[PDB]
Amino acid sequence: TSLVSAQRLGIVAVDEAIPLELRSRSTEEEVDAVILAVYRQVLGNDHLMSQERLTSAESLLRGREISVRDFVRAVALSEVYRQKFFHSNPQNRFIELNYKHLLGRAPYDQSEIAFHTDLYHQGGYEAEINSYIDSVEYTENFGDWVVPYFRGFATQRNQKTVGFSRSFQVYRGYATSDRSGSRSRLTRELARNTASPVYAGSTAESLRGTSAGSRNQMYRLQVIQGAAGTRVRRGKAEYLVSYDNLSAKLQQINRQGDTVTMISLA
């Protein structure tokens, strides 16, 4: 997005990224750059050890035996990808990782989860991975020669608006990676077809003044609450409390039986 919003949201570097295409008669440097970009994208920006590199697939790409899309698929099917993102993750976390890594977006609806859980149950891991790379969405955005890149922060034809808000759950900043498994932050909002506020970059910040206690820190607690006391006006609530009152607030929420969905510094 434009500087005014991208700066607040921590996505300036994403906005200025340029799709990388492997051209005919590319140099050795250009192939090297492409291999690096694929590893960064498909492996979610993990530090890649030399022992983990796909020696053979790299050779074939460099020899123009296989396309960039073939090389993306080789990496996605590799044991490295499996160990990083599949063997230690629940399925729905695995699926959103595939959407981030391979399509550069967040899942749009629960039925995408259902489709891919069914496909894994039917044809296993390879069939699941191939669905992303062979999809119309992959072919029309990246084709055979362009390295995948994150798309979720830009208006895409045939996207859902909530794809933009959800992007911030799966993209956590430039200096981040999908390395620790874990659970999906998207589970509830996918299942119930809703959206969640975007607290990223500097949008989590809230004013302190003289009301933020001894450490001048506020914490934002997002809860789901019901009336099991004073009247509850909203099923979803946020509380801003200082560090000194944070234990009391948790205990209050806990005593009321309400669910904490997220807590972060404000």
């Binding site: 119930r192 077809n193 809703t194 789901i224 019901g226 009336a227 909203r234 099923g235 979803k236």
Partner: protein, 172 residues
């Protein structure tokens, strides 16, 4: 909240403009409808309990899954909450009618209601159905020609229908 008059005022102040003759004339016409507005509010209010309970009974009859064990309206506590929500919505609809502006209904009642209902598992589409039943009963009551000076309330009745429709659309 805004009423029919302050709504026009707020727009004019932002433009730095006196209200125009046409706008003043439009408000004059609103004033001429006042007695019929008042009567409609009084008629819905006077029948509020019947409207809510009949709509609720009709709703549960058509959607028995709501009150079967495990249903969202099952147990006294959830049945009570459900009846309260029906009353709440009807009440704010009457507020909007009284003020002649939807802002009270939108700000105080509908804003966030879909979000509340999804978060807590309340079947919004069933709330919408009940609202529609309350709409039909209230409009019948408003339109009843007995015991009232005869006249044409179609404009106020249309405005009231718009408020119920907003309420139904907001919960689903």
């Amino acid at each position: 909240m805004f009423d029919v008059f302050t709504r026009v005022v707020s727009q004019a102040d932002a433009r730095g403009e006196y209200l125009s003759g046409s706008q003043l004339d439009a408000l004059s016409a609103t004033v001429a409808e006042g007695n019929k507005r008042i009567d409609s509010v009084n008629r819905i209010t006077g029948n509020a309990s019947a409207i809510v309970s009949n709509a609720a009974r009709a709703l549960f009859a058509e959607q028995p899954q709501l009150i079967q064990p495990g249903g969202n309206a099952y147990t006294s506590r959830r049945m009570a909450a459900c009846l309260r929500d029906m009353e709440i919505i009807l009440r704010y609809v009457t507020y909007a009618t009284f003020t002649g502006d939807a802002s009270v209904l939108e700000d105080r009642c509908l804003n966030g209601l879909r979000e509340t209902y999804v978060a807590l598992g309340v079947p919004g589409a069933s709330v919408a159905a009940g609202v529609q039943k309350m709409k039909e009963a209230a409009l019948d009551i408003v339109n009843d020609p007995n015991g009232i000076t005869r006249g044409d309330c179609s404009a106020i009745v249309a405005e009231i229908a718009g408020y119920f429709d907003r309420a139904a659309a907001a919960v689903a």
